[PDB]
Amino acid sequence: LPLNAIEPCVICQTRPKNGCIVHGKTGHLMACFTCAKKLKKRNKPCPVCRQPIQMIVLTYFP
Amino acid sequence: LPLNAIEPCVICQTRPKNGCIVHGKTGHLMACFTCAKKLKKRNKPCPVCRQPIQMIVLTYFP
Ligand SMILES: [Cl-]
Ligand SMILES: [Cl-]
Ligand SMILES: [Cl-]
Ligand SMILES: [Zn+2]
Ligand SMILES: [Zn+2]
Ligand SMILES: [Zn+2]
Ligand SMILES: [Zn+2]
């Protein structure tokens, strides 16, 4: 089970990990929506795998 | 912060929550990839919001 999912965004260290960086059928979830959207807007790659960012998904945990 | 992110798949109660159900620019992450992919294969809606499932994203937590 992913025990690190409850830690804050690794970029701003303030908001929760709710900005999923999607590339193909995988995603890296380590940033908040705010931070992740700035990377997409700036045409930056995924911070952990450097693949292109297809979209940011605002991720809820029901 | 999403303290329920580290609980198991609400469907199979055995695998981790790594199957993000994506609809538009939002996602609900409460199931594993295995369970979520069965819903997408059967064209079932999102279990919590009933929107159509565009894709399942295999979600990693770096
Ligand atoms: Cl945010
Ligand atoms: Cl986007
Ligand atoms: Cl899919
Ligand atoms: Zn952030
Ligand atoms: Zn990535
Ligand atoms: Zn499951
Ligand atoms: Zn949903």
Numbering used by the authors:
A (entry chain DDD), B (entry chain AAA): 430 to 491
Q: Which sentences from the paper describe this structure?
A:
We identified G443 as a single residue being responsible for the pronounced aggregation of MDM2h, which could be eliminated by a single point mutation G443T. Since the G443T substitution produced a stable MDM2h dimer, we wanted to understand its impact on MDM2h’s structure and function. G443T is located near the UbcH5B binding site and is in proximity to UbcH5B’s K4. Based on these observations, the G443T substitution impacts neither the RING domain fold nor UbcH5B–Ub binding. Indeed, SPR binding analysis showed that the G443T substitution had minimal effect on UbcH5B–Ub binding.
The importance of the ubiquitin ligase murine double mutant 2 (MDM2) as a key negative regulator of the tumour suppressor protein p53 has been studied extensively. Second, it promotes the proteasomal degradation of p53 by recruiting Ub conjugating enzyme (E2) thioesterified with ubiquitin (E2~Ub; ~ indicates thioester bond) via its RING domain and mediates ubiquitin (Ub) transfer from E2 to p53,8 where Ub is preferentially conjugated to lysine residues located in the C-terminal lysine rich region of p53.9 Although the relative importance of these mechanisms is context dependent, in vivo mouse studies with ligase defective MDM2 resulted in the same lethality as MDM2 knockout experiments. The RING domain of MDM2 has been discussed as an alternative target to stabilize p53.19 The rationale for this approach lies in MDM2′s ability to still bind and inhibit p53 when MDM2-mediated ubiquitination is abolished, thereby preventing uncontrolled activation of p53.8 The RING domain gains its E3 ligase activity through dimerization with either itself or the RING domain of its catalytic inactive homologue MDMX to form a homodimer or heterodimer, respectively. The dimeric RING domain arrangement is essential for E2~Ub binding and activation as demonstrated by co-crystal structures with UbcH5B–Ub (en dash indicates covalent complex).
